[PDB]
Design a binder for this molecule. Sequence first.
Ligand SMILES: [Zn+2]
Ligand SMILES: [Zn+2]
Lengths: 192, 138, 8, 114, 48, 48, 103, 426, 244
Amino acid sequence: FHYAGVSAKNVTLGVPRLKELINISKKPKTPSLTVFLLGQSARDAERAKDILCRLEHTTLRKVTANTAIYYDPNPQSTVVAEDQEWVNVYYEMPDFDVARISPWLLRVELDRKHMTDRKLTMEQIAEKINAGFGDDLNCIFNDDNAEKLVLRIRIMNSDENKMQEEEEVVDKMDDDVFLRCIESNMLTDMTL
Amino acid sequence: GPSSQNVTEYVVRVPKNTTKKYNIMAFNAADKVNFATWNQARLERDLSNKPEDQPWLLRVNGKSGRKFKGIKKGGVTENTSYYIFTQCPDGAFEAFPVHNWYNFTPLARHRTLTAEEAEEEWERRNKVLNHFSIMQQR
Amino acid sequence: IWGIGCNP
Amino acid sequence: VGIRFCQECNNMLYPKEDKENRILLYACRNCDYQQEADNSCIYVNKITHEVDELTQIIADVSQDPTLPRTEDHPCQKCGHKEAVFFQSHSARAEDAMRLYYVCTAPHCGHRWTE
Amino acid sequence: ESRGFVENSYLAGLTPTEFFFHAMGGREGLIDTAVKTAETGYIQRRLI
Amino acid sequence: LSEKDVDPVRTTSNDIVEIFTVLGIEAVRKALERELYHVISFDGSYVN
Amino acid sequence: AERGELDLTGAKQNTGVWLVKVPKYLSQQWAKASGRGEVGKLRIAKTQGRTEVSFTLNEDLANEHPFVLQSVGGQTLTVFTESSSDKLSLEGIVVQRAECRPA
Amino acid sequence: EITPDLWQEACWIVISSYFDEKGLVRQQLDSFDEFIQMSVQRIVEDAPPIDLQAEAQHASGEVEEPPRYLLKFEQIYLSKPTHWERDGAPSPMMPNEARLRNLTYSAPLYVDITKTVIKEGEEQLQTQHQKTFIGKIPIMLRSTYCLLNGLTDRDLCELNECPLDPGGYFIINGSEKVLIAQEKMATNTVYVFAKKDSKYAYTGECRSCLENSSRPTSTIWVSMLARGGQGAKKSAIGQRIVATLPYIKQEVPIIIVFRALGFVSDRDILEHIIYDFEDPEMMEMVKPSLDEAFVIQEQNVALNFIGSRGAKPGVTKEKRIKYAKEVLQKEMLPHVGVSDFCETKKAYFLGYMVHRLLLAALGRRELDDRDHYGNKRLDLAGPLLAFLFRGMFKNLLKEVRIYAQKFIDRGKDFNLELAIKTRIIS
Amino acid sequence: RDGKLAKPRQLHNTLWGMVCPAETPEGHAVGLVKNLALMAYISVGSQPSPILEFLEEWSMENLEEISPAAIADATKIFVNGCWVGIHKDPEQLMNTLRKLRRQMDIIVSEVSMIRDIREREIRIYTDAGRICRPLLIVEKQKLLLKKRHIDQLKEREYNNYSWQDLVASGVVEYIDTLEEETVMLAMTPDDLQEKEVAYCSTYTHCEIHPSMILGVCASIIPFPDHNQSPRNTYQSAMGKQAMG
Ligand SMILES: [Zn+2]
Ligand SMILES: [Zn+2]
């Protein structure tokens, strides 16, 4: 305390920082890294902001306004009234529904302010989720023009049809419990 | 009519002694207790020691019906008394002191996990599999 | 006792 | 959204997919009771957890001597001049210095945020 | 005034709330001194 | 450091252990000297 | 028909009873004699849309008690008696609760 | 009828009256005074009556085999501070003479002891030893039992005592000793704190005690485990609430504790925990803990679960169940109740603790401050000497029991006067 | 004393009027050894039974049927621990309790009754350790202390009027830290109670005199408000060492 606030970043100073340096502690109280920019990004603020976004950890929780799990029996049923349009669009030429579709729907809704602050893209988030998790999680993303940024996630189509698994016809972690586990993993570990 | 201005006043009688003691039987509202199906009931002192200062066990309609457990009220009414007013042909209210207060709570007539199996199941706290299927297996 | 930047 | 209890043993119901009719159910694990799901929604999580604290504000709060009050903002219902105002008074309220107002005078208890 | 600002000077004399808040600040300084001595002594012994 | 548009020459961290594992023992020698000098001279005090 | 059987005839007849909380001075006054068969008079006066209940203390006993009603919809109460002949019985169901307060 | 701008005289007149009635050391004195009277009687009353009979195996036959000896401590008495000279004649001891001669300013303590003996012939005999001397209690100076009490300054000067001396200290071995009030956390109060490095995100503690009659504190924790730990089911369930009940080796799930109190149904447990069922956030908070305790659905099973985790295992199953039940009735939430049907009250208070933890977790209430002096109490001379006398009187009863048991196994007789060791208390 | 944490030692706000801010030892025990303020009193303890009987008489239904009900039953009456029921009307109960504290029937001067309007709890603590101080009582904007009481106290001897009569009249009241949390105080009657630009118009109590926040050793310091704060601690320590 009483450190002059040149920047909005606290730094250990005084006896505690001398203790940290002298003890060579593995865990500093305030580990910090000063980064200098090589090119014109140093001069121009927008490019510096781009570098800042590329260097700052962002989880899906930071950009997610609210998450809900709806049991949707049919994709065409569209239990949520809003998705009825865009779901239809995606199911005008349905993809990956050939195996099956999950009866449970994770309808994540993202805050536009956070998305635009981090300059994230719906295609970017959807690609990260779908590619990292694999074909098991199928994601439907809204247009940015739509008032609500909605990502509709469903569990593995082949796992739902169970032809691919074969083996024994026994539910593992049911489906909604597995979906909640997936939601927690996305919230804290997406690393978008 | 007379119902809009009726005034009823009745005599109060308190006999010194009654052959049958008076108690209070209280059921929780959420239990939805119904006496129409109460064809028979059995109220007796518990045997959990496997008398007058022990809880009560009620078994309605034998084993097929619901069972209830009643416990006397721990807080004594050192500064309070409760009386019950009952209609009688003479038209006078009769007040009887409440000897005891009992709160009866039901026990489901459902299959009950054995203690050994319950301990074995708790050994596997992380029940990744559905618990409903586990209950069906038991 | 002075301010936030000084002493207590 | 909410939690509902069984009608026989008063235990907690759990959601279960009906594989034949594709209709969500709630079944008690300790008995055979089943009831169809009317809401069709199960797990809702608000990460921003934006909740109007007017639901969490008690009208009785208008009786506290230690709270500040102003006559500038009148009540909507009764048009009473006194109004006792206070901040969030809640942890994890994000950042909110908004003043919430509670109407003085008996039993009105109207709460407005400006 | 509520959160601790003392507008009176020492010559003028602190008002009662200002007096209590000034006592809080002085107490913090004294605690800092007393706690400091031991940690610095340990560091000096280690270095030597 | 390896991110694009980040100067590899001048980007530094306060953590001496990270400086060790990444840049070497001589780099730590210098970085530890820099950190100690900063904590000593923040008060304005000078140590040779 | 057994020793543990509960005589549910009162429940079948749906006999309604009133439960009242009364203070210790009133109960002790009643218990003083307790054998004269009389302790006071309960007077209930009903109006177009309001009813009031009061109890008058016996003049001999003294040498007004308004009653306040309480809702009984939150809990179902019944009264049962254990006869000295080990014949349990049910007297009725509580349909109203009241409290007696000093004047 | 007002006193405006004349206030400087008024405030100091009322302060003068305050300090004229009381003085500065009224804490110490008052505490000690209260202690003596109330505390000693209470302790003497609260200690269990001594029960005693000869061993059945020692003597053949049952005619005189149970000679029950029952000792009850009826009433307490304190004389004025007294010194017993070498000749043995009692003399009043003035404080100044105690300082000069290096004596202790103390008063004798007499207890009426009633010995009732049942010889199995149903002819129980009650003999009352009145004014039995059990020890000497040091007397705080200028307290109600000090000789200097109620003496005008002239009389104090006659005794070579200062009129201005405050008192509030004891003369022990000729030295003046002052009991220093000891700060402590308040008892019978639920406090929710947050520990950063703990495995629990929040912990609610109640340092419950039954009017300090016994067991200085019986602390019980209800803590919500942190969600930081990552696992498949761990991520699915979220934060779970556990209870660190006293006399139990490890954590116990809270719903199991509620079912051990006889509340098996989940609806009733939540009725105690969640006072408003309509609020969805708290119900969602409580759901994982219900999931954890889904296995145990019976009171007996929950009692067995508690007993298995007890500090000392019970070989028999029903032994474990009975041990857990008695441990809950005595050790857990003693201030709420200790016997009979206090189980509903204990369930309601434990539900309050869980509810307060839930409010803290949801942010609806702020975390308690340990430094807030409302959460603090000060043990003066009274509580400290009361704790001391509890311990020493229990030891005195123990020694009386030992001597009595020896002489009773002989069957000769027992004498109260020889059993009592005044050394213990003094 | 070994612990170097600077949390338990700092002068807390709640120490106002009950522990001397200046008088503390310096060294390993800074802020850990404290001294009572001049007017501070420490509760001796009382039996909670008469309070519980009064509460039962007023209302406080215990063993109710989940009646809290989003605390529809405003406030839950606590005692020294021990939730003993709840009441539908909390303000009438609190006013009745204060009147009883004045009449000294069931509530001794030491009995402390706290209502938390939000969170709806009333605590009613009488537990033998609470540190409390006397504060004058302000009804409306007028102190209850009036010229009659001051004149009778001024004639104190041969008038048999004392502080206890001032307490019995209801002019002054003992307030502990928990109640200090729920009380609006005025440092001075004239400066604060009197009508001005209205800071507060709901003062419930008034300080008898601010200087009483100091202890015995700091009370000898003349003009202590004109010195730096550590210097008053130093003077407390040194006045314990003066020869007289
Ligand atoms: Zn069920
Ligand atoms: Zn209004």
